[PDB]
Coordinates of N, CA and C in Angstrom, one line a residue:
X1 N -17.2 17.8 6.8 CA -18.1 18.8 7.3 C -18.1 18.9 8.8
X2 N -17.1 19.6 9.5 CA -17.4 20.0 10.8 C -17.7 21.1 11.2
X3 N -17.4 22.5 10.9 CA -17.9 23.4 11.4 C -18.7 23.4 12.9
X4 N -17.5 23.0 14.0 CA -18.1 23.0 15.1 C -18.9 24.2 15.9
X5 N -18.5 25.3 15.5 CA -19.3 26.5 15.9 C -20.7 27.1 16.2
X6 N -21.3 25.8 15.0 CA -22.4 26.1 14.9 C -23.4 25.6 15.7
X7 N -24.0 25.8 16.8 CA -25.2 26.0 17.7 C -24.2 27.0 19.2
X8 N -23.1 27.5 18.6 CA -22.6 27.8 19.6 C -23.4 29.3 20.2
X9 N -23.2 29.8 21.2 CA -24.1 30.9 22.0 C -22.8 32.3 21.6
X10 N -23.2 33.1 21.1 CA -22.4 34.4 21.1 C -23.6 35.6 21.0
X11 N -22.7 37.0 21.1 CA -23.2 38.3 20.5 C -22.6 38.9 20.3
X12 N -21.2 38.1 19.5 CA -20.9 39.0 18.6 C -20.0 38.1 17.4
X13 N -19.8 39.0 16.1 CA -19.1 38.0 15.0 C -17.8 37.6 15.5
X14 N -17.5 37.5 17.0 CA -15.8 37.0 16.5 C -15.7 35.2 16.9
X15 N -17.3 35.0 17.8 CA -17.0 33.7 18.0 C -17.9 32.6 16.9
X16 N -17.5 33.4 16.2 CA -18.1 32.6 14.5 C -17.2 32.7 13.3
X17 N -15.9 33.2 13.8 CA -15.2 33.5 12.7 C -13.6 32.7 12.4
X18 N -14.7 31.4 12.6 CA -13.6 30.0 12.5 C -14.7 29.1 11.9
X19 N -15.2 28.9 11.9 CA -16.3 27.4 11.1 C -16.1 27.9 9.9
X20 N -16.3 27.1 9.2 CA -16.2 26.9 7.3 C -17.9 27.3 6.8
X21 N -18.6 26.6 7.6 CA -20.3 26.7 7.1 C -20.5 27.7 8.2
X22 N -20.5 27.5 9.3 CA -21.4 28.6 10.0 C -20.6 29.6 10.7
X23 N -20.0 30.3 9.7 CA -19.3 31.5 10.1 C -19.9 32.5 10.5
X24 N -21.2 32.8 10.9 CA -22.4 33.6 11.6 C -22.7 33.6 12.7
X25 N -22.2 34.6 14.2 CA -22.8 34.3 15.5 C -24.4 33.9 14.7
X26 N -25.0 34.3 14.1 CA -26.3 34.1 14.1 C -27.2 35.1 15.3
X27 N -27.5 36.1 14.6 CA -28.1 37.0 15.8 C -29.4 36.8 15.6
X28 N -30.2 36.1 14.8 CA -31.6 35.6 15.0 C -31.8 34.9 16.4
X29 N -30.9 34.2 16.8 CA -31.3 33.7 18.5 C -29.8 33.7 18.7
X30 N -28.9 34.2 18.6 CA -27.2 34.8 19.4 C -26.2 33.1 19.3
X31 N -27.0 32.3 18.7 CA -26.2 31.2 18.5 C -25.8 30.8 17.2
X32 N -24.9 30.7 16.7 CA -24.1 30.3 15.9 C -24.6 29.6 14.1
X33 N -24.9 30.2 13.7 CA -25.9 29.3 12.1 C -24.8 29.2 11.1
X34 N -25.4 28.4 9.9 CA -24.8 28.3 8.8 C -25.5 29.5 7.9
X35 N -24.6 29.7 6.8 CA -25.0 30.9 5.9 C -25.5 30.4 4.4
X36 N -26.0 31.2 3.6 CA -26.8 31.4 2.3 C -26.0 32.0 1.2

């Protein structure tokens, strides 16, 4: 389980479109989440 991505800071999907779990900039706060 690494999905390093995740708390990372973006606004947009491309710098989330490498982790395994948190393939979501996450635009709830532009940083990086896991998904559902």
């Amino acid at each position: 389980q690494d999905d390093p991505t995740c708390g990372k800071p973006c606004n947009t999907m491309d710098d989330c479109s490498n982790g395994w779990f948190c393939q979501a900039c996450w635009n709830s706060r532009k940083t990086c989440g896991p998904f559902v």
